[PDB]
Design an enzyme around this catalytic site. Structure first.
Site, short mmCIF file in Angstrom:
data_model
loop_
_atom_site.label_atom_id
_atom_site.label_comp_id
_atom_site.label_asym_id
_atom_site.label_seq_id
_atom_site.Cartn_x
_atom_site.Cartn_y
_atom_site.Cartn_z
N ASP A 1 -1.00 7.38 -8.24
CA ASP A 1 -0.77 6.19 -7.59
C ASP A 1 -0.21 6.74 -6.96
O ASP A 1 0.85 6.62 -8.13
CB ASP A 1 -0.72 4.98 -8.68
CG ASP A 1 -0.25 4.21 -8.32
OD1 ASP A 1 -1.27 3.47 -7.11
OD2 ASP A 1 -0.08 2.68 -8.82
N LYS B 1 2.89 -0.55 2.03
CA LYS B 1 5.34 0.18 1.50
C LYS B 1 5.29 0.35 2.82
O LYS B 1 6.12 0.21 3.72
CB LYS B 1 5.36 0.05 0.43
CG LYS B 1 5.91 -0.81 -0.26
CD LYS B 1 6.17 -0.71 -1.83
CE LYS B 1 5.79 -1.31 -3.28
NZ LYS B 1 4.77 -2.09 -3.18
N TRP C 1 3.86 -0.69 -13.59
CA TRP C 1 3.17 -2.16 -13.80
C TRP C 1 2.49 -2.70 -14.24
O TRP C 1 1.40 -2.28 -14.11
CB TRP C 1 2.61 -1.94 -11.97
CG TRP C 1 2.48 -2.61 -10.69
CD1 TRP C 1 2.81 -3.55 -10.48
CD2 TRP C 1 1.18 -3.18 -10.19
NE1 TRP C 1 2.61 -4.59 -9.41
CE2 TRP C 1 1.18 -4.03 -9.65
CE3 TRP C 1 0.16 -1.98 -9.91
CZ2 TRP C 1 0.22 -4.54 -8.15
CZ3 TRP C 1 -1.14 -2.25 -9.03
CH2 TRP C 1 -1.15 -3.64 -8.63
#
Ligand SMILES: Cc1ncc(COP(=O)(O)O)c(CN)c1O
Ligand SMILES: Cc1ncc(COP(=O)(O)O)c(CN)c1O
Lengths: 396, 396
Positions: free
Chosen positions: B211, B246, B130
């Site tokens: 993460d 999410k 990312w």
């Protein structure tokens, strides 16, 4: 890797709260916090806020990310509050606003933006200021210097000392001003003093940074923004960090704004792109709930009216407590005049109590003020005033 | 002061969204976002979330600030999700959790904590990662280096190249691992590969930084945490940045956590005091609404069950779309095998489309993927699959 990390120091305000919680005595009085409390000693959710939250619960259909700068209506309402409807700054599109996690978040965004994109090395803050100002600016790699502010002798603004202090600030230094309701002193510049400072700041090449934590708690929404607007009339560039924590009672929802002003629309948009980059690398985009509540209220005639009256009620209750405090100290036989308290604004006042008097107040009487002598006037009630003032008279 | 600021560059993901909004054609397909979408193409508020928000509206009596580290129940529920109920890390009180504004906020807090309190200079990230990882770590003054990850030839983990890449990492460097559902590739280590990495990391003296943006989207809550738990079994110290954006559909409420693990309770508490100092100088304390929703759900048997089923439904719909995508490409006459898509996990896959094929897909067919070839599998539906696959076959 973590073996030899040194513990972070105690911290004056949050540490006091830890002591108050550990203290199991019955008649305790907390004047050491930074939140509004009503006549019952509680920090309620505002009615306007509950009504707005019901509307959101009923109407929201997604939690999809906001833009980096947050809710557009929130930005527009914020700029109108700060600058006034029909301000040239708004008409000329010279201002851009990012919704941030609280006023603290706004200050951090401003500091990161300045550290990374400008020649700024140094921020001037009042002596005293909220101790978190130093921590925020230092975390961005900026030096903090102090300017004289508080006249400890007569509890007024030492305007001559302020001006003389700021002679040491170079062109390109940032100067932080509390927009109203100074923390911790409650001492604000008069309009004429603001105007004098605005002129001096242009002459000397300072970048003004305004911190508005309590808009509406001194005299009113428009009046409290007079100083900022005097600066805005004179400057090509400034930054405002503002908070809705106190004036909407939205502390834990983290509702603030960082407003960037430049000479023209092209310049501010370019600069704001880097402010957005600073946010992107920090928390990505801002929390929607509290800011949506604010936008919902500010943009609806009915809700805005309810809210403005709630804010008026808070402002007025604080003013009543200032008067009652002064009156009660006099009739309990205090050995000094406390009339300066009536002239101070917002949540906070410097009591003029020494660090030892505040220690004694906590240990002997269960009355809690900050070590500096800061009291939260909103912590005072008609019910706790007599015991509070009796304790104060006892330590004088 | 702002005259010569250079505009921030376009940004690949957010810039694409800007293009999609400006594009007024009718049959457009958006695979370029990072949010879950259901079979109707919407990102709804979860039912469990609405139920929790109703409960908060009815029961909250204050918005007084949370602690710097946020809601205690949120921290406890977070540690159980990450480490497992009855984990030695929890029993031995070796872990401390701060609630943060999103997973991004957690990464920023971790980076500021490390920059200020340790000898860390360097963070290793997968090639690709990312793009915000680099921005976050760089903003804290940390260098970012890349390790090999993606085998562009057969769309699998290049494990030998990964190991060989990380030979260059020195003791005391941080190595970032995506806990599951790699972004952007959807390629995750197997359990045995995680175990191999855990052993190597101990040997080489790396600080692991995990993460977790999508826990529950690969195989399930417990299964997706296996890799982390393999590391936790072996390491004295690690950090986890986790997100509820999410898996609770809480994107804009900014709900994440930074979890610090050290050798023992004394050490972690000391280190965590400086993590709290890093938060204090950033945004002061975290936003309550989204985290309160998560705590409310995770700590209530009825709500937790509803939520876990909603998460299962999202995970399963993505799996159905992976299978359907592969099947449909085959029957529309695609000239390569796409079976690798079924082995990839979570929201994202690398399609293997070239940058020019993705440009052509946008310009000619109104199909939007990220320039790297990243597609959001949750952007696929039974209704849009045929036109999507027809467009892809056309550009091959
Ligand atoms: C001077 C000053 N500035 C900024 C803030 C920021 O408050 P918040 O982050 O809660 O908006 C406060 C409230 N303590 C304050 O008193
Ligand atoms: C790898 C990765 N890490 C961190 C995050 C953080 O997301 P958020 O800040 O919304 O929790 C995301 C979501 N884009 C991600 O994909």
């Amino acid at each position: 890797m973590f073996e030899n990390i040194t513990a972070a120091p105690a911290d004056p305000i949050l540490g006091l709260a830890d002591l108050f919680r550990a203290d199991e005595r019955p008649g305790k009085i907390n004047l050491g916090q930074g939140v509004y409390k009503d006549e019952t000693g509680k920090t309620p959710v505002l009615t306007s806020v509950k009504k707005a939250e019901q509307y959101l619960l009923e109407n929201e259909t997604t939690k999809n990310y906001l833009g980096i700068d947050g809710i557009p209506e929130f930005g527009r309402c914020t700029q109108e509050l700060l600058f006034g409807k029909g301000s040239a700054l708004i008409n000329d599109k010279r201002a851009r606003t990012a919704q941030t996690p609280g006023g603290t978040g706004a200050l951090r965004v401003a500091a990161d933006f300045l550290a990374k994109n400008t020649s700024v090395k140094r921020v001037w803050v009042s002596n005293p200021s909220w101790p978190n100002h130093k921590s925020v600016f230092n975390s961005a790699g900026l030096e903090v210097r102090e300017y004289a502010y508080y006249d400890a002798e007569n509890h007024t603004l030492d305007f001559d000392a302020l001006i003389n202090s700021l002679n040491e600030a170079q062109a390109g230094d940032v100067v932080l001003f509390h927009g109203c309701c100074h923390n911790p002193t409650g001492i604000d510049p008069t309009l004429e003093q603001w105007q004098t400072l605005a002129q001096l700041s242009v002459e000397k090449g300072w970048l003004p940074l305004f911190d508005f934590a309590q808009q509406g708690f001194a005299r009113g929404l428009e009046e409290d923004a007079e100083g900022l607007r005097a600066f805005a009339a004179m400057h090509k560039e400034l930054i405002v960090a503002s908070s809705y924590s106190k004036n909407f009672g939205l502390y834990n929802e983290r509702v603030g704004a960082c407003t960037l002003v430049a000479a023209d629309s092209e310049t501010v948009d370019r600069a704001f792109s880097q402010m957005k980059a600073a946010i992107y690398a920090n928390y990505s985009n801002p929390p929607a709930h509290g800011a949506s509540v604010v936008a919902t209220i500010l943009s609806n005639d009915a809700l805005r009216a309810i809210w403005e009256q709630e804010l008026t009620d808070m402002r007025q209750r604080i003013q009543r407590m200032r008067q009652l405090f002064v009156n009660t100290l006099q009739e309990k036989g205090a050995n000094r005049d406390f009339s300066f308290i009536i002239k101070q604004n917002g949540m906070f006042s410097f009591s003029g109590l020494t660090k030892e008097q505040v220690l004694r107040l906590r240990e002997e009487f269960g009355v809690y003020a900050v070590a500096s002598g800061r009291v939260n006037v909103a912590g005072m009630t008609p019910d706790n005033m007599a015991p509070l003032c009796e304790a104060i008279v006892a330590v004088l």
